Write an enzyme that holds these catalytic residues in place. Structure first.
Site, PDB file in Angstrom:
ATOM      1  N   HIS B 708       0.735  -1.271   0.000  1.00 47.31           N
ATOM      2  CA  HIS B 708       0.000   0.000   0.000  1.00 47.31           C
ATOM      3  C   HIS B 708       0.765   1.324   0.000  1.00 47.31           C
ATOM      4  O   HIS B 708       0.330   2.308   0.630  1.00 47.31           O
ATOM      5  CB  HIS B 708      -1.040   0.001   1.146  1.00 47.31           C
ATOM      6  CG  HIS B 708      -2.089  -1.059   1.004  1.00 47.31           C
ATOM      7  ND1 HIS B 708      -1.900  -2.361   1.427  1.00 47.31           N
ATOM      8  CD2 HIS B 708      -3.316  -1.023   0.429  1.00 47.31           C
ATOM      9  CE1 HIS B 708      -2.965  -3.079   1.116  1.00 47.31           C
ATOM     10  NE2 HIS B 708      -3.840  -2.291   0.511  1.00 47.31           N
ATOM     11  N   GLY B 880     -10.376  -3.568  -0.046  1.00 46.23           N
ATOM     12  CA  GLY B 880     -11.139  -2.427   0.430  1.00 46.23           C
ATOM     13  C   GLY B 880     -11.258  -2.525   1.943  1.00 46.23           C
ATOM     14  O   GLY B 880     -10.261  -2.403   2.661  1.00 46.23           O
ATOM     15  N   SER B 927      -5.259  -7.690  -0.182  1.00 42.32           N
ATOM     16  CA  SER B 927      -5.603  -6.735   0.872  1.00 42.32           C
ATOM     17  C   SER B 927      -6.834  -7.179   1.639  1.00 42.32           C
ATOM     18  O   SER B 927      -6.823  -8.229   2.296  1.00 42.32           O
ATOM     19  CB  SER B 927      -5.854  -5.376   0.278  1.00 42.32           C
ATOM     20  OG  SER B 927      -5.538  -4.416   1.239  1.00 42.32           O
ATOM     21  N   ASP B 928      -7.902  -6.390   1.591  1.00 46.05           N
ATOM     22  CA  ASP B 928      -9.091  -6.836   2.319  1.00 46.05           C
ATOM     23  C   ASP B 928      -9.472  -8.197   1.721  1.00 46.05           C
ATOM     24  O   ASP B 928     -10.209  -8.988   2.352  1.00 46.05           O
ATOM     25  CB  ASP B 928     -10.252  -5.851   2.187  1.00 46.05           C
ATOM     26  CG  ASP B 928     -11.304  -6.064   3.271  1.00 46.05           C
ATOM     27  OD1 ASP B 928     -10.940  -6.166   4.478  1.00 46.05           O
ATOM     28  OD2 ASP B 928     -12.496  -6.152   2.918  1.00 46.05           O
TER      29      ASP B 928
END
Lengths: 11, 1023, 214, 107, 107, 107, 70, 11
Positions: B708, B880, B927-928
């Site tokens: 990120h 997300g 990620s999420d």
């Protein structure tokens, strides 16, 4: 800018 | 003044490379260098054709390089020509739609997701007739394609990753090779990421940092016999390219050559190449931020780190005399203004008197300031920083004085009474340290007595405090009016309209002024007493809504209201939140609309002037007395003037400072930051374009070896973005006519899920496209281009089907059709699963963990949750934050039923899955997406199928932009899984059953992951 | 349908989930459009609703819409050439102001379906000279020709197609406490959508129910 | 007013008797009021070592499933910020042990 | 718009206009646009009927009268040279046109 | 039908309004779609037009007959080498000079 | 497809001229040609300084080349 | 009355 512009952590 | 050189390619003694977004060619023999192509936009890649004559070029357009397409360059005549009209979506980290390689016959093969439902699906296509036709290779997603002894070599996710050094996640570059004219085998799959593959002789050379730093390596065409050929230590090497004899690459802004037969490496000499005008002009509105109204009808605003005092017309303008980085400007008096000046050391308070011209600037460091205000009497200022402190700064001396510090979040919501005696502000707090919700209570600070009082209780969210002019009552808002609103699709409820205003009289015994209690019947005339004032609180009789501000006036109260709205546009298109200014008459208690289409509002010191921004992005100003007489604030009458190098240094330092200040781990941030500063700073002076600075900044971001770390927005070019004409169809050049190969459609009844041709009542599949808007398309006419030029409008399309079946229709030509492809895909997989399981298994796909993910999940969840089995496909999931909300639904265990007199059974809970669940994931889910994946296994919801996921679980919440709009992100919130720690970071989540999706799987047109998912559930469903 | 002359009732269709109370009859008395509740599975937690059209001639039932969500409030235009209706298909989430949650509050949008294939969505204002209509009724695969009308998503309960405008009944998002414990009625407003200017305006507020003349 | 007073009294009592280690939430019914009250306290009482979910006198309705779903959330992760405090995952999860109280007036 | 010249209103609220030698039939919003199918140099465009438009096409040899039916798509183009045309009009009944040239003739 | 009015205002924009309700005017949008052309096709066309005007309007017809025919091909051969408007300018002005008269400009 | 070349200047074996509104330099010795300055607007004149190092350039701007500067 | 007057089972 506003008092409800949510700021949560994105992944 | 040397230039930054990068992304090279070689052919003999000629070497092409990029300098100042333009393409250059250099001749080793004569040492001459020249620009061979420019003014096309930002070029990041150029590739020599076999013959070494033509050159395939990838160029980006759109102020933020949001779009891209490919061009051809014929060095013989110097002809340029656009080849693709796909307008591929690209980002710094994922610069898709590029050259993949060349086939034996010398034909260009490109990689693009332009016709795919997912950006990661960068499929291989063979270019023909210069863009007239594209032939799919059907080898699945791939970044590079090479050919060794008639054998296809596939490079997956093999592009460079400068923003994440030491990456070892599921999406790391890997290499595969053909072994039997269709049979493929993975041959290079190291612990770390492999990029820029090339073949010299019978060896594949690539880059990797398996040893801690970027180096070139190579192996035979079997992945065996690994060898390290370089020992760099200054800057990672990048962009390997070759001609078959020598290998070319860039490093630290220079071009190097590596001869495999000698293992010798040397820097090519280029020296100064181009030094453009340092002084640049910019449109102030383009970078405008912070707009505040001053006395005398003057306006102040910040833009590109500069500040200005001007009249509304923008005819009389004064620049604040202060070096780069002014963050904020605020009315400080008749002709004075306070401002916040930001430097590498931190933020400082400053004052400027635009009448006399004087401008002192305190030296006391305030930290990272995010809010600033000055009292009406110009005595002190109030400031909030990222240390979660709220403080007053004596405008006379500069001595800051901390009032209070929160340990949860910043105290940016505050106000000062007109008599300068009290300060009311929202104070974030938590009941417990690991509490999932942060509450906020209003606090009041009394300058006399210097004590803090509690204006409100700490059970919810109180905000927007505001004193009345007389300083007798404190008004504020709260989300305390709980009342649920029903969901129209899913059995659910949420708090939409629960905002209400409240007031608190500062003098006990005094009533709520809006209650209109007759004065004769109230015995006021008391004195200030802020003790237990939260007990005297009272609401004002206004319907609950979603209020963001309250402004108490003499016989009325203004309230800013935001109608309930969806979040999709704001989440994926940056769509601003639309509000409306309401007026509440205290006497008649009647509410009315004063102004709509607002996106922001500021109010004058004397409460007489109102300044606003509307949904059109423009700023306006109007008297509170006659809101019908608003004027537009003009700011572009005068050009903004700056120095490229001064800004580049400033931006680099800011990027570097943010990266350090926000990294989730402070200790780590201390060593990493200090160890990379100078190294990357030395390249800044070589940068002449925004894209140059980007190369430098991202590389320094990679030093954190964490996920990120992105760079979004910013102004890199002034070229209009590439356009693409779409009608959700796939054309095939058959003979000298285009035939609709495929006509995409998801749910015919939803909005935007099919080719616009369907509205005319026919499926275009199989028809021939004669022409578009009178222009014949086909063998000698690129249909992609013709469509490109009609995007956004309707064009007459002539179609021919079975027999004399000729149609003449006005078709809408879309600017994009990704979503249509996506939903088509999902419905295809959904039909497939129902047919293969014989109607016994459901199917749901989740594209991301954002708003789109919430839409798609429910869109199918409400119809697919009641099969014996259920497949939850989260492949390509963009992440997300809503994974927890979805997992919650999947977690519901059905334990009852409802038996009606008439009708069918109702399951309890309603939102429960009926049977066995099976999850599907791949390296493109992250990620999420990683979190959801790990979670599914951890909670034992079912088996997880596919391939290890991305591995990036350190989240972001940016809160600063560079002076040019650029938004950088810093991995600030490290996810910790119980019984795994931070382990998922830089690794991902392993599936219970690994099912590779090899290139030969794509050649056979079969989805092994989904088949196994189906077969597996079928086996589990025999009880 | 009940023959008003004799009294003989004649069943058109039967749902096995809920009552078919949402229906309409075209002005030429030829077609009958109605919401048809259905479930994908017998133990399914949600009941879907698709619009069905019955043709008195041919006595056959056609599928006006797919069965993946909730379609309702069918309405024919006076000329009996287009079928208008509403749907909760415009998924777009709205954030909760207190709890980490989201729900579908404004996902209602109107759609239209021309009864004559090749005919375009009337509200799209496609120039007549550029459209080759003049076809005949064909209700086959009519759900494929469906098209939406360019109106902001909201919570609509009725759509009335008129000559050069369309009336729409809208219900602002509101809490449920009063209605749940005090019998408080749901407040709506009557909107007007000008087909030509595509501009919307409020025709009447504080409404709780609306009926329209023949 | 009497009801909320009662709830805050029991809530203060539980915090004092458990020495600040146990939360408290009351659910009056399974209708809209129940949804209000449940969240009104849930957002502040879910992160104690223990939690008491008092549903005595609960008048019924139909949202028991939506509440049970929240209480079913098992905390399996945390979020570590550069500044501030930990964030639990899921956000809507109870931190520790849960205990339910019911009577003949809950139906 | 940068090179727009000659703007004329047609039946059905349609608009016709010439730009950079090209001609177009469109709705006022400019969403539905039709390019007249004729090579470079259209000087003028004029309502010729319900869905027909007459235009003046200029070449090196001179100006010529042409007709185009945007509904059917047909577009014949006379070969009689009119000289250098500076004005053009069509009768309401689509029977004939009136033209002026630099020879000072009206016809 | 005398029912629709189309106008251009001092802001350069085009508008349209009904003769019945002039308050309801709409702006004619024309830039929604890009204008598409070929540099070389226009350059040839422009050169020929320039050349034709120079001949048709020269004050002396006899002179215009010889000068024009004697310079056409000569300057036309350079048009295909032009890639920019400024290139075409160099060619067109030089052919205009062939009239050896004043007031031959290009604006 | 040859280009239109014009407004030249010379200094030794190097020769600068205009092509496509951009400035080019050509070396008689090697026969190499390269663009040395572009995207400034329309350039109609370029003049070598005495030393043959710096070059004074006149460039025009405004859709109709109504303005100019050096 | 309306087309969204929810009718769920009460307990």
């Amino acid at each position: 800018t506003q008092k409800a512009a949510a700021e949560l952590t994105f992944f | 003044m040397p230039n930054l050189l990068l992304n090279p390619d070689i052919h003999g003694d000629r070497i092409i490379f990029v300098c100042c977004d333009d393409l250059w060619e250099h001749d080793l023999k004569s040492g001459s260098t020249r620009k061979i192509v420019s003014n096309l936009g930002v070029i990041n890649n150029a590739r020599f054709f076999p013959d070494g004559r033509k050159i395939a070029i990838r160029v980006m357009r759109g102020s933020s390089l949001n779009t891209a397409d490919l061009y051809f360059y014929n060095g013989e005549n110097g002809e340029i020509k656009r080849i693709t009209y796909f307008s591929g979506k690209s980002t710094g980290r994922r610069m898709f739609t590029d050259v993949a390689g060349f086939d034996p016959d010398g034909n260009l093969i490109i990689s693009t997701d332009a016709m795919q439902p997912f950006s990661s699906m960068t499929c291989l296509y063979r270019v023909e007739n210069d863009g007239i036709n594209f032939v799919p290779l059907n080898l699945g997603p791939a970044t590079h394609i090479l050919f060794a002894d008639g054998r296809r070599v596939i490079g997956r996710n093999t592009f460079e990753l400068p923003h994440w050094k030491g990456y070892r996640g599921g999406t790391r570059g890997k290499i595969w090779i053909e072994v039997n004219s269709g049979a493929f085998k993975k041959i290079v799959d190291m612990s770390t990421h492999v990029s820029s593959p090339v073949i010299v002789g019978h060896r594949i050379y690539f880059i990797t940092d398996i040893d801690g730093f970027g180096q070139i390596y190579s192996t035979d065409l079997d992945g065996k016999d690994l060898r390290k050929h370089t020992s760099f230590t200054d800057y990672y090497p990048r962009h390997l390219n070759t001609d078959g004899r020598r290998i070319l690459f860039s490093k630290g802004g220079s071009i190097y050559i590596f001869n495999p037969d000698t293992e010798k490496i040397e820097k090519i000499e280029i020296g100064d190449l181009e030094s453009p005008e340092d002084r640049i002009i910019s449109i102030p509105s383009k970078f405008a931020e912070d707009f505040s109204p001053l006395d005398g009808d003057l306006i102040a605003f910040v833009s590109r780190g500069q500040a200005f005092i001007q009249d509304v017309s923008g005819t009389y303008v004064l620049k604040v005399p202060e070096p780069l980085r002014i963050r904020y400007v605020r009315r400080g008096g008749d002709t004075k203004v306070a401002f916040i000046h930001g430097t590498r050391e931190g933020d400082f308070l400053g004052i400027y008197d635009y009448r006399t011209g004087k401008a002192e600037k305190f030296e006391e460091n305030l930290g990272n300031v995010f809010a600033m205000g000055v009292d009406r009497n110009g005595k002190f200022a109030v400031v909030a920083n990222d240390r979660f402190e709220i403080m007053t700064v004596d405008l006379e001396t500069g001595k800051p004085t901390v009032i209070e510090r929160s340990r949860e979040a910043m105290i940016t919501d505050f106000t000062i009474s007109d008599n300068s005696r009290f300060i009311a502000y929202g104070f974030p707090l938590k009941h417990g340290e690991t509490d999932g919700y942060v509450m906020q209570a209003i606090h009041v600070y009394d300058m006399e007595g210097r004590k803090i009082f509690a204006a409100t209780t700490e059970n919810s969210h109180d905000y927007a405090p505001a004193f009345d002019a007389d300083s007798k009552n404190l008004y504020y808002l709260s989300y305390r009016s709980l009342d649920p609103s029903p969901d129209r699709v899913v059995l659910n409820f949420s708090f939409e309209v629960v905002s209400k205003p409240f007031v608190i009289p500062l003098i006990p015994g005094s009533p709520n002024p809006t209650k209109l209690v007759p004065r004769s019947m109230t015995s006021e005339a008391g004195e200030y007493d802020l003790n237990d004032m939260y007990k005297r609180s009272s609401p004002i009789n206004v319907d609950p809504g979603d209020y963001r501000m309250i402004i108490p006036l003499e016989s009325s109260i203004l309230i800013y209201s935001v109608p309930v709205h969806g979040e999709f546009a704001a989440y994926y298109q940056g769509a601003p939140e639309k509000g409306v200014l309401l007026k509440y008459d205290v006497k008649t208690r009647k509410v009315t609309e004063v102004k709509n289409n607002l996106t922001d509002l500021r109010l004058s010191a004397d409460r007489k002037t109102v300044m606003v921004r509307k949904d059109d992005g423009k700023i306006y100003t109007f008297p509170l007395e006659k809101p019908e007489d608003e004027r537009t604030v003009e700011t572009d009458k005068r050009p903004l003037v700056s120095s490229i190098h001064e800004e580049f240094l400033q931006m680099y330092d800011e990027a570097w400072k943010l990266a350090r200040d926000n990294y989730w781990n402070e200790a780590v941030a201390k060593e990493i930051s200090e160890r990379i500063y100078e190294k990357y700073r030395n390249l800044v002076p070589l940068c002449k374009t925004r894209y140059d600075l980007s190369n430098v900044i991202v590389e320094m971001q990679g030093e954190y070896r964490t996920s990120h770390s992105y760079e979004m927005g910013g102004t890199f070019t002034d070229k209009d973005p590439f356009r693409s004409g779409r009608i959700a169809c796939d054309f095939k050049l058959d003979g000298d006519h285009y035939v609709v190969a495929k006509a995409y459609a998801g749910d015919y009844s939803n909005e935007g899920e099919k080719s616009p041709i369907f509205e005319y009542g026919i499926d275009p599949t199989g028809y021939l496209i004669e022409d578009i808007d009178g222009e014949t398309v086909g063998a000698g006419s690129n249909i992609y281009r013709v469509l490109s030029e009609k995007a956004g409008t309707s064009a007459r399309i002539r179609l021919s089907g079975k027999g004399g079946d000729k149609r003449d229709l006005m078709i809408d030509i879309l600017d994009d059709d990704r979503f249509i492809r996506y939903r088509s895909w999902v419905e295809a997989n959904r039909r497939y699963v129902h047919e293969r399981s014989k109607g016994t298994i459901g199917y749901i796909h989740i594209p991301d963990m954002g708003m789109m993910g919430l839409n798609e999940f429910y869109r199918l969840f409400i119809n697919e949750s009641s099969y014996q089995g259920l497949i939850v496909d989260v492949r390509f999931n963009g992440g997300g934050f809503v994974s927890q909300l979805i997992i919650e639904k999947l977690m519901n265990k059905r334990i009852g039923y409802d038996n009606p007199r008439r009708g069918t059974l109702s399951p309890y809970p309603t939102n429960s899955v009926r049977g066995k669940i099976i999850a599907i994931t791949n390296e493109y889910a992250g990620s999420d997406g990683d979190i959801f994946s790990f979670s599914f296994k951890k909670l034992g919801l079912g088996k997880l199928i596919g391939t290890r996921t991305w591995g990036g679980v350190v989240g972001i919440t940016p809160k600063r932009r560079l002076i040019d709009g650029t938004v950088l992100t810093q991995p600030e919130f490290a996810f910790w899984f119980r019984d795994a720690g931070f382990g998922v970071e830089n690794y991902g989540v392993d599936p219970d059953v690994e099912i590779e999706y090899a290139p030969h799987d794509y050649l056979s047109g079969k989805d092994p992951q989904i088949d196994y998912a189906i077969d597996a559930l079928i086996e589990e469903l025999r009880n």
